[PDB]
RNA sequence: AAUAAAUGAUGCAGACAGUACUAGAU
RNA sequence: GGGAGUACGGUCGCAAGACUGAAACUCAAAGGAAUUGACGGGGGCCCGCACAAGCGGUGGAGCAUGUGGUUUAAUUCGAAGCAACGCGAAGAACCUUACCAGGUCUUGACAUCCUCUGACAAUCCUAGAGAUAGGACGUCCCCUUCGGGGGCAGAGUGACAGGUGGUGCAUGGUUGUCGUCAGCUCGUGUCGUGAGAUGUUGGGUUAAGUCCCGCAACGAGCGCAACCCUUGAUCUUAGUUGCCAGCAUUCAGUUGGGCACUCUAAGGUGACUGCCGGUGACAAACCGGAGGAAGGUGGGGAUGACGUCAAAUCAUCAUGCCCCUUAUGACCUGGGCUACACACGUGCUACAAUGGACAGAACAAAGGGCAGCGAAACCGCGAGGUUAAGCCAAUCCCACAAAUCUGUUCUCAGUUCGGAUCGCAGUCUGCAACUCGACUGCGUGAAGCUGGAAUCGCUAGUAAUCGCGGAUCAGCAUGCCGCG
RNA sequence: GGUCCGGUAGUUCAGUUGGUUAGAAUGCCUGCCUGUCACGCAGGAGGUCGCGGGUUCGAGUCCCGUCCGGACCGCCA
């Protein structure tokens, strides 16, 4: 037993709900609906680099709003992403999906895009020191109280996995006011699994 | 022998009550939820990551 | 650390006293006050109507009887198991008064409680009696143990 | 007329594996 | 270094022994100082139901449940002191089901691949236990400017699929313990040639390495309190599906009527050492004092610091490696998962007069309701069955809480105690309670009369104890979650 | 070979003599404490009286014969 996430406390406090809607008789199967729209989309956009993806009921319309951190690879020309972005899912789903797309500014900030070129530079062979303290830096350049980068698993080596900490700033998990953003990310080498913990400390709310 | 379950919990069952439940994301019987029909470590999973609107941290 | 406080509820109608309060809180199982009223009332009734006096003096005797003065404290100094008298502060003798009351009233046995708690206190009044027993035991092992009066 | 702070010596607890165990590069 | 101050030899001595003093063999260490941690039956000091005093249990008995032994067609597998044993698994008649007997299949139950032939489905007879076939009725597919495309079924090919197969001594992810204990660290500088220390040591103080003083050190992070939620009191916002007093009506709070007031759901305030005295250094800090609902984190919940246990999970999921593949994969009927000369954890019921049975009476708090919850009426001693109001819910229902009190009655007995085992007859469900639920009535009723070492929980609305609702659920709770 | 003594829980000794009845420790098992052990504590089972006959209502016990393990003599020339 360890600590727990922020994403599952902060919720009530400061974050607002990823899902805004209220239903009835049907909120397991919206819920799996979601589920798979979610699942769909990472594994489709997995290249583009999507952060986190919304959705809001709106009696049988439903509006997704997408964070990316780069227009250009998710919407390209506008038509041709747009297009296999929407019919698809109207396909799988049964009903009208409308897609919004916003940009991530500072995109080396978000925790979970972060984990993931952690992971793509380990996929690489990069070390998993160059890698984590030059990520480290960027984030901080970028501008964040506080950066908390964890790898476990085989890191090179077959009898032992252990753990690795890297983190400047202020990292204070057990204040509620932290507007944490945590993500987690997978990365399996020819070695075994190895599994990257980041969660960023942004800035409090007064 | 997981989505080789998950095929037969799909199957039609001869008599409706020869029917079981399955939290339609993970093979784990033993206690599946109905209101959210999600496995027990997953819907815990989907309510930390902000899903299901309805669910949060309980305190009395 | 230190010691605590605490309170209790006098009136009562029937031989108003705070001791009978005590005693009324005593002898309770299962929460259930009401019997354990029930029954101290009936047994003074019954104390009142064979005997032709206030129930009330007759249980401050009963007390004053079986109240321990000296109480014998065991204590282990080396392999000896040494005991060692003590002084019982009012608190305490009321308290094991209470205590050995009741526990020979429910042991002696009879057709009910009630009876049972009158013959109680009547062999209380009476220094002869089953909790006496006690007292008097309690007061040999302080005599003996004199020894140890002070460490 | 006043009024003293003491007193101290505690008996018992024997053994635990043979072979095992984390790495790092300007 | 051990061999070894040993053996041979020689001198001394009454003797004990003393002096001199090797070799073979064997190991790559033996040893001195100091640094960190660890431990101690060394010391000082502090507190945690730890001890002391008690309230009630376990350990005796019946039952339920789980684990080891033994027995099986299988009794699927994991977990093993604290940190396994009412734990995974919040409900095994099939289904869940993994395990086994039998009947079977092999691009397979499941997803991408390729060539086509076109909708499949849906009703019906035989074998069936069914898998599956023998089959008949029958297939209605659509979209375009004629190629084709969007699924489903089939007919062939191999890439593949399957792994509840192993490795938690390779892992990700998730949790238990120390531990809600208070410590664990970093930048700069100094010292020591070194591991390292200084900051973190010393004094006071706190639940806290919380804070203050001194300070060869100055700052900072993870922690700790803090802001998060709940409850304890108040101002305002609002009175319908809440309340009924003032008003008039009612068998009913049912109607007109009021939002006075509980109440509910919103914004605020409030308790923050806020104020005074004393103590303490004048500080940090502690005792008392008025107010107040709240006095010294008000109570509780969430929040579990670096790391330890090669701790648990390859079984939730993925996972490299290894292994099977017309089988360690897949379909179906039945069985087993529920057997017990046994022993042990946890829980329930009992041994009776604070009691047993019968008559009358009051108060609840929380939660649920759409193939769902189901008023009321009737039938039946009964579990329950029939018609059915109402409710997508402050409306209606679940749902008349029991302990408890006031009476009648029995009487100290293996009993008018207990209801287990038990025979019969029935109720809820479901194709079917036979291996395999619960409940009800009939007739009996033992073990059992307080239980061995030893052991467990509990400092206030706690202990003990009486009922209520939900999860898993067609139907299954002495266990779980909460409430009173 | 001749006299004398015993054959009892798995082991060591009681019980026999008194004819109607089998005991103490050790040992094993269960339980408790202990992280694991020993030590420690509470219980349980376990002998059919070496073997075969005879007096009997009845023999571990009384009287016999037999097989064992022991205590002594098996001499005189």
């Not at chain 1, 727990?4 to 805004?20: A, F, H, Q, T, Y």
């Not at chain 3, 708690?117 to 209380?124: G, P, Q, S, T, V």
């Given at each position: 037993?360890?600590?727990?996430?922020?994403?599952?406390?902060?919720?009530?406090?400061?974050?607002?709900?990823?899902?805004?809607?209220?239903?009835?008789?049907?909120?397991?199967?919206?819920?799996?609906?979601?589920?798979?729209?979610?699942?769909?989309?990472?594994?489709?956009?997995?290249?583009?680099?999507?952060?986190?993806?919304?959705?809001?009921?709106?009696?049988?319309?439903?509006?997704?709003?997408?964070?990316?951190?780069?227009?250009?690879?998710?919407?390209?020309?506008?038509?041709?992403?747009?297009?296999?972005?929407?019919?698809?899912?109207?396909?799988?789903?049964?009903?009208?999906?409308?897609?919004?797309?916003?940009?991530?500014?500072?995109?080396?900030?978000?925790?979970?895009?972060?984990?993931?070129?952690?992971?793509?530079?380990?996929?690489?062979?990069?070390?998993?020191?160059?890698?984590?303290?030059?990520?480290?830096?960027?984030?901080?350049?970028?501008?964040?109280?506080?950066?908390?980068?964890?790898?476990?698993?085989?890191?090179?080596?077959?009898?032992?996995?252990?753990?690795?900490?890297?983190?400047?700033?202020?990292?204070?998990?057990?204040?509620?006011?932290?507007?944490?953003?945590?993500?987690?990310?997978?990365?399996?080498?020819?070695?075994?699994?190895?599994?990257?913990?980041?969660?960023?400390?942004?800035?409090?709310?007064? | 022998?997981?989505?080789?379950?998950?095929?037969?919990?799909?199957?039609?069952?001869?008599?409706?009550?020869?029917?079981?439940?399955?939290?339609?994301?993970?093979?784990?019987?033993?206690?599946?939820?109905?209101?959210?029909?999600?496995?027990?470590?997953?819907?815990?999973?989907?309510?930390?990551?902000?899903?299901?609107?309805?669910?949060?941290?309980?305190?009395? | 650390?230190?010691?605590?406080?605490?309170?209790?509820?006098?009136?009562?109608?029937?031989?108003?006293?705070?001791?009978?309060?005590?005693?009324?809180?005593?002898?309770?199982?299962?929460?259930?006050?009401?019997?354990?009223?029930?029954?101290?009332?009936?047994?003074?009734?019954?104390?009142?109507?064979?005997?032709?006096?206030?129930?009330?003096?007759?249980?401050?005797?009963?007390?004053?009887?079986?109240?321990?003065?000296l109480?014998?404290?065991?204590?282990?100094?080396?392999?000896?198991?040494?005991?060692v008298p003590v002084e019982?502060?009012?608190?305490?003798?009321?308290?094991?008064?209470?205590?050995?009351?009741?526990?020979?009233?429910?042991?002696?046995?009879?057709?009910?409680?009630?009876?049972?708690?009158?013959?109680?206190?009547?062999?209380?009044?009476?220094?002869?009696?089953?909790?006496?027993?006690?007292?008097?035991?309690?007061?040999?092992?302080a005599?003996?143990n004199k020894a140890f009066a002070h460490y």
């Amino acid at each position: 037993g360890q600590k727990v996430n922020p994403v599952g406390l902060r919720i009530g406090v400061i974050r607002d709900w990823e899902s805004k809607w209220y239903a009835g008789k049907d909120y397991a199967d919206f819920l799996h609906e979601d589920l798979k729209i979610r699942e769909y989309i990472s594994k489709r956009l997995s290249d583009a680099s999507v952060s986190k993806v919304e959705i809001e009921r709106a009696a049988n319309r439903v509006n997704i709003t997408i964070h990316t951190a780069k227009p250009g690879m998710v919407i390209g020309k506008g038509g041709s992403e747009v297009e296999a972005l929407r019919k698809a899912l109207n396909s799988l789903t049964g009903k009208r999906v409308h897609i919004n797309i916003l940009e991530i500014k500072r995109a080396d900030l978000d925790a979970q895009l972060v984990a993931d070129n952690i992971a793509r530079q380990l996929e690489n062979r990069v070390s998993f020191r160059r890698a984590q303290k030059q990520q480290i830096q960027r984030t901080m350049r970028a501008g964040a109280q506080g950066v908390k980068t964890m790898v476990s698993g085989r890191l090179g080596g077959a009898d032992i996995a252990r753990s690795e900490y890297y983190s400047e700033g202020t990292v204070p998990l057990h204040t509620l006011r932290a507007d944490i953003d945590y993500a987690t990310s997978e990365a399996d080498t020819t070695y075994g699994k190895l599994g990257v913990k980041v969660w960023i400390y942004r800035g409090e709310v007064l | 022998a997981k989505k080789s379950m998950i095929a037969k919990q799909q199957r039609t069952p001869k008599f409706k009550v020869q029917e079981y439940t399955r939290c339609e994301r993970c093979g784990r019987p033993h206690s599946v939820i109905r209101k959210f029909k999600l496995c027990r470590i997953c819907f815990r999973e989907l309510a930390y990551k902000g899903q299901i609107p309805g669910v949060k941290k309980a305190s009395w | 650390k230190g010691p605590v406080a605490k309170r209790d509820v006098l009136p009562d109608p029937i031989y108003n006293s705070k001791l009978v309060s005590r005693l009324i809180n005593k002898m309770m199982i299962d929460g259930k006050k009401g019997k354990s009223q029930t029954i101290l009332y009936k047994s003074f009734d019954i104390i009142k109507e064979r005997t032709g006096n206030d129930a009330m003096e007759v249980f401050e005797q009963a007390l004053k009887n079986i109240m321990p003065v000296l109480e014998v404290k065991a204590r282990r100094v080396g392999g000896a198991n040494y005991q060692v008298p003590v002084e019982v502060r009012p608190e305490r003798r009321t308290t094991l008064g209470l205590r050995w009351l009741v526990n020979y009233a429910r042991l002696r046995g009879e057709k009910t409680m009630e009876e049972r708690l009158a013959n109680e206190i009547l062999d209380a009044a009476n220094n002869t009696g089953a909790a006496v027993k006690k007292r008097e035991d309690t007061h040999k092992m302080a005599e003996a143990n004199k020894a140890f009066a002070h460490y």
